[PDB]
Design a protein around this ligand. Sequence first.
Ligand SMILES: NC(=O)Cc1ccc(O)cc1
Length: 147
Amino acid sequence: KLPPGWEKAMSRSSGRVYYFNHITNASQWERPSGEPARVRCSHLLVKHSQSRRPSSWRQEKITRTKEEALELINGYIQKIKSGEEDFESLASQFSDCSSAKARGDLGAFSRGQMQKPFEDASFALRTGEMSGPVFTDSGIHIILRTE
Ligand SMILES: NC(=O)Cc1ccc(O)cc1
């Protein structure tokens, strides 16, 4: 059927079928197209008060709730998908990760190096594909697989 990780779903608001990936939290209308030793990804991290280190270059003390963090993530995803903003621009401006200064680029990595939900989403993404909200102990990620 579908490249594993993917399931069919029904829009509650339109009744149209769409596809959801439970590893990447990506969702799309089209039927999904369908592993390498390494992948390259960028990300945009929004931390919250329960993050492993509730601090970043943007904010000495990160006080926002997980819910508020997810709302910010959802808004970034919306602007990226509409083309109002580029992933790289939002990462540089708003990612709570030091990789903001590199447009969110983390370089290439193997399995075993990253936090598990991040790794699984990264490796389940296709080249050029973007995740939905991915939750780790650092916060909530938008992940872009670049290679
Ligand atoms: N550690 C991971 O698995 C992803 C990650 C989380 C926070 C960062 O500041 C950079 C990378």
